[PDB]
Amino acid sequence: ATVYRRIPNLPDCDIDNWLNNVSVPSPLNWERRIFSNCNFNLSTLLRLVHVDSFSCNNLDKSKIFGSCFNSITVDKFAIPNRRRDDLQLGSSGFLQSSNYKIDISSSSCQLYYSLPLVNVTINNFNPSSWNRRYGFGSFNLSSYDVVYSDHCFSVNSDFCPCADPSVVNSCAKSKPPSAICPAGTKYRHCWCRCSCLPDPISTYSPNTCPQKKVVVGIGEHCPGLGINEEKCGSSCFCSPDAFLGWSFDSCISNNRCNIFSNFIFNGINSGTTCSNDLLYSNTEISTVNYDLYGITGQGIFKEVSAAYYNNWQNLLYDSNGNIIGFKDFLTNKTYTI
Amino acid sequence: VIGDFNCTNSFINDYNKTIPRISEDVVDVSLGLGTYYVLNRVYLNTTLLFTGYFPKSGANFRDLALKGSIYLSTLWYKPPFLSDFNNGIFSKVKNTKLYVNNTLYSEFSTIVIGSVFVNTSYTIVVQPHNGILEITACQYTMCEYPHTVCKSKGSIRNESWHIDSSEPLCLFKKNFTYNVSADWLYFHFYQERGVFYAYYADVGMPTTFLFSLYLGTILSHYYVMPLTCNAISSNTDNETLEYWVTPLSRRQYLLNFDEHGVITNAVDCSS
Ligand SMILES: *[C@@H]1O[C@H](CO)[C@@H](O[C@@H]2O[C@H](CO)[C@@H](O[C@@H]3O[C@H](CO)[C@@H](O)[C@H](O)[C@@H]3O)[C@H](O)[C@H]2NC(C)=O)[C@H](O)[C@H]1NC(C)=O
Ligand SMILES: *[C@@H]1O[C@H](CO)[C@@H](O[C@@H]2O[C@H](CO)[C@@H](O)[C@H](O)[C@H]2NC(C)=O)[C@H](O)[C@H]1NC(C)=O
Ligand SMILES: *[C@@H]1O[C@H](CO)[C@@H](O[C@@H]2O[C@H](CO)[C@@H](O)[C@H](O)[C@H]2NC(C)=O)[C@H](O)[C@H]1NC(C)=O
Ligand SMILES: *[C@@H]1O[C@H](CO)[C@@H](O[C@@H]2O[C@H](CO)[C@@H](O)[C@H](O)[C@H]2NC(C)=O)[C@H](O)[C@H]1NC(C)=O
Ligand SMILES: *[C@@H]1O[C@H](CO)[C@@H](O[C@@H]2O[C@H](CO)[C@@H](O)[C@H](O)[C@H]2NC(C)=O)[C@H](O)[C@H]1NC(C)=O
Ligand SMILES: *[C@@H]1O[C@H](CO)[C@@H](O[C@@H]2O[C@H](CO)[C@@H](O)[C@H](O)[C@H]2NC(C)=O)[C@H](O)[C@H]1NC(C)=O
Ligand SMILES: CO[C@]1(C(=O)O)C[C@H](O)[C@@H](NC(C)=O)[C@H]([C@H](O)[C@H](O)COC(C)=O)O1
Ligand SMILES: *[C@@H]1O[C@H](CO)[C@@H](O)[C@H](O)[C@H]1NC(C)=O
Ligand SMILES: *[C@@H]1O[C@H](CO)[C@@H](O)[C@H](O)[C@H]1NC(C)=O
Ligand SMILES: *[C@@H]1O[C@H](CO)[C@@H](O)[C@H](O)[C@H]1NC(C)=O
Ligand SMILES: *[C@@H]1O[C@H](CO)[C@@H](O)[C@H](O)[C@H]1NC(C)=O
């Protein structure tokens, strides 16, 4: 009975196109994008994206339809199908210890969707500065294998795990193999035995090792893996074998990959990022109370042929001031009264 | 002095002599140059008596174009350069056509309209990129001394028209395309009942509809942002920036729509 037509003022952000990118992130290097000042549709997102599981928390399912928001953050990463039971609301296992942390306070939704593995790739970049500083390369993994971690540590801006050769030669016994430490950083705290024995991952007492067991938080990334101090040795070029504390897992399920996505909405019932699901529901004009481009009225519609419309003129008005026709901006179908 | 934010103070000086010229070209609206089409209406073989916002028939333009090479004076930002946006403005812009390596580039100034130019309020920015026009109505933080920087022949300064780490609360963002090899572009801007309406045209024809946005506030000041270029002068070429503007007022016009809808003859009720 009601035909609502109105051109949007803000463009579309294509959340589905960003979720279906050829470069799929990893549990460690989970990506995001601040979607704002756009319109999002739930039906198209659930249709195009192959939805497998969907839930929410601190908000109703029907509440998302129609409500406006200020910003949307989509924290996505490929599912490690091995550890799927770790993605629980309030978990502290292997997943939520060195990876993305689930939001509990604000309204947050969770989605688990499949994606074809054809011509797709998995990105496993390490978003750490002190890791890339001390000679970090890659992991040399195979296709369709995502990298995650459980233990996460941190160091200081002037901490050299690869000690200076002077400190190594000063301690005749219990000397750690290490090359020339670069400048601008203090050497490793160390016959003088050093700290963090036998490895920074597992220690007898955390007070004797300057690398403290750090955890993740809301939007916080792991500062880096547990790089072994006495396993490098070039100006402290660390071998890729000295980077421990990580793990790799496949994502093959019915010959397809799986990706989890956490949606965080900021600005409940505010902002301009509104959902056009409640208004744009029928979108089918039958040959009727209409609200077209702000003009409200009542009348019957018919299908005729017309070619006298420009690229900015949709409504047809007469010299008296009444509307007698219009053009649908979605199907180019001219409907006259 | 348009906004309130410290942006830069390296090249800041004063001046004593800048007159904004007054073109001898009177406003001729008999051929349809000076009017605008309706928002989204189509007419065929009719005479529409439209009571809208139009410039004064047979008036003069005030050139608010400002160019610069090394320095810019604070007097350029003070009145009367910041004219009182009472009802609206009709602007004629000279499409600066530069030739670099036998290819063409289109350049002209940008427009910023705001009440107090504070991020707690809404301001509209119209920026011409190469072949594109970007319109953004956002809560931009306007710089103290904004200026547009050349991107086709280089500029010593850097472009500074807003400072925002994240995207502010925008109400309208859109892009349009225009012909790059044009001579004079025309623009119409006005406000009514808290709604801002804009129109544009590439050639000497009535301006086409751009957008209409509801704000609820009252716009106070419009500004044509100056341009900083290195090779636009008297030593490298002989063409400059000519931005003419005329104030709008509420008046009644008569437009003639032909069989197709093209405006042929428009008349004003002021003899
Ligand atoms: C919205 O606009 C307001 C008004 O400009 C912004 O407040 C201004 O923010 C700047 C940058 O933080 C302040 O500059 C600083 O001033 C202090 C002295 O108070 C100085 O020591 C610093 O070196 C720096 O120059 C400025 O003072 C401040 N204005 C006022 C009146 O306090 C605000 O940041 C803008 N917000 C957004 C989100 O854009
Ligand atoms: C925007 O969201 C609405 C809300 O779901 C969509 O409307 C549904 O469309 C599907 C088919 O596209 C129908 O099967 C449903 O019955 C519609 N919902 C209702 C309540 O009628 C709409 O299609 C979406 N827009 C686009 C372009 O996909
Ligand atoms: C409705 O008609 C317009 C006008 O032809 C179509 O817009 C054109 O779309 C094609 C392909 O997407 C482009 O190559 C043209 O440049 C577009 N022209 C203009 C003027 O925008 C539009 O695609 C049509 N829509 C439907 C659903 O048929
Ligand atoms: C309107 O056009 C401008 C100019 O091309 C677009 O700005 C570009 O945006 C892309 C992607 O964000 C950047 O890679 C370019 O560097 C930008 N160019 C400039 C000159 O800033 C803008 O995105 C367009 N907006 C819309 C809604 O189409
Ligand atoms: C942009 O403007 C130029 C300048 O008028 C247009 O070039 C004209 O094109 C017509 C059509 O063939 C010719 O008859 C004129 O002789 C051309 N004039 C000049 C000075 O070259 C150009 O066509 C316009 N762009 C578009 C897309 O229409
Ligand atoms: C802009 O036009 C002026 C006027 O013709 C040019 O000035 C002349 O330049 C030629 C060549 O350098 C001299 O021989 C004349 O004596 C100049 N006349 C005057 C009155 O100064 C000027 O060169 C042109 N601009 C450019 C960049 O060529
Ligand atoms: C020829 O000089 C121009 C130019 O380079 O194109 C032209 C003109 O002299 C002037 N620009 C304006 C709008 O007045 C401008 C200023 O006179 C100078 O650039 C110096 O201006 C200041 C404020 O120092 O210089
Ligand atoms: C990659 O696979 C997807 C899923 O089948 C498909 O949509 C896309 O077109 C493919 N890309 C190429 C370049 O074949
Ligand atoms: C990666 O591992 C494969 C396994 O045999 C090996 O052939 C290849 O040389 C390795 N590449 C690097 C850069 O380590
Ligand atoms: C603006 O900031 C610059 C440094 O970026 C400073 O030199 C200048 O004094 C400031 N202007 C003020 C505070 O008016
Ligand atoms: C413009 O930005 C560049 C990039 O850092 C900088 O090197 C240059 O000094 C800036 N120019 C001015 C005039 O501030």
Side-chain angles (χ1 to χ4, degrees), chain A residues 17-177 179-229 231-240:
Chain A
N17 288 120
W18 185 77
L19 291 178
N20 298 330
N21 186 21
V22 293
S23 59
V24 177
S26 60
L28 178 59
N29 190 264
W30 54 271
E31 301 178 359
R32 60 165 55 181
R33 178 169 296 183
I34 312 298
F35 297 96
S36 60
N37 303 94
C38 63
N39 307 121
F40 60 96
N41 188 291
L42 276 306
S43 180
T44 304
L45 179 60
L46 300 184
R47 283 167 54 187
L48 297 186
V49 180
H50 191 276
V51 179
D52 300 335
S53 180
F54 179 79
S55 300
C56 291
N57 180 77
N58 285 83
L59 80 170
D60 187 72
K61 296 299 184 301
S62 61
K63 185 182 301 180
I64 308 180
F65 299 90
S67 299
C68 302
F69 300 94
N70 280 82
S71 60
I72 297 180
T73 75
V74 187
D75 308 308
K76 66 169 184 178
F77 56 91
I79 287 177
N81 287 127
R82 179 192 304 177
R83 304 184 183 275
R84 290 201 70 261
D85 57 329
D86 302 67
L87 292 176
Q88 298 178 0
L89 301 181
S91 179
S92 60
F94 290 78
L95 216 293
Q96 306 181 26
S97 300
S98 181
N99 300 121
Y100 172 68
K101 176 60 181 59
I102 307 300
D103 175 67
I104 59 270
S105 60
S106 179
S107 60
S108 181
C109 292
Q110 297 78 11
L111 179 68
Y112 309 82
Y113 68 94
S114 60
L115 188 68
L117 83 179
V118 42
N119 80 85
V120 83
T121 180
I122 301 297
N123 181 86
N124 299 269
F125 179 81
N126 193 265
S128 180
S129 60
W130 61 286
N131 283 247
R132 290 297 181 180
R133 275 201 55 182
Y134 293 88
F136 175 78
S138 179
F139 294 154
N140 191 23
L141 256 295
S142 60
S143 178
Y144 311 136
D145 292 317
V146 298
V147 183
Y148 60 94
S149 180
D150 44 65
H151 280 270
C152 182
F153 295 86
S154 297
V155 298
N156 298 120
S157 180
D158 303 67
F159 178 80
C160 225
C162 168
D164 192 71
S166 60
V167 187
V168 182
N169 294 127
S170 62
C171 315
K173 302 178 60 180
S174 301
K175 43 184 297 180
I180 300 179
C181 166
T185 52
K186 187 180 180 300
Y187 301 149
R188 177 184 178 182
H189 176 268
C190 295
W191 186 12
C192 14
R193 55 242 58 90
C194 302
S195 60
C196 311
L197 304 321
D199 60 326
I201 302 297
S202 300
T203 179
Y204 312 97
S205 58
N207 59 86
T208 53
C209 179
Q211 301 188 14
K212 273 70 184 62
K213 309 181 64 60
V214 74
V215 298
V216 299
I218 301 300
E220 303 178 359
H221 298 73
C222 166
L225 304 182
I227 308 177
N228 195 95
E229 301 178 353
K231 209 177 295 300
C232 306
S234 60
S235 180
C236 283
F237 183 84
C238 284
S239 179

Side-chain angles (χ1 to χ4, degrees), chain B residues 113-129:
Chain B
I113 303 180
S115 59
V116 291
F117 302 95
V118 186
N119 45 16
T120 58
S121 61
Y122 291 95
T123 173
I124 305 178
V125 180
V126 179
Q127 182 178 1
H129 306 273

Side-chain angles (χ1 to χ4, degrees), chain A residues 7-11 34 36-37 70 271-272 292-293 295 308-310 312-319 321, chain B residues 37-44 46-48 166-174 207-209 212-213 260-261:
Chain A
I7 48 180
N9 300 330
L10 303 175
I34 312 298
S36 60
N37 303 94
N70 280 82
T272 57
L292 313 176
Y293 310 94
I295 303 300
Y308 43 83
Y309 292 86
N310 297 327
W312 70 95
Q313 302 173 350
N314 296 17
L315 297 181
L316 181 58
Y317 271 78
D318 48 64
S319 181
Chain B
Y37 282 92
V38 209
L39 290 81
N40 49 341
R41 278 73 181 276
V42 182
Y43 298 93
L44 299 85
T46 50
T47 59
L48 209 287
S166 178
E167 179 180 359
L169 211 166
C170 299
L171 298 181
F172 182 85
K173 299 174 58 181
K174 197 155 291 180
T207 56
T208 64
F209 181 78
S212 62
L213 179 59
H260 301 284

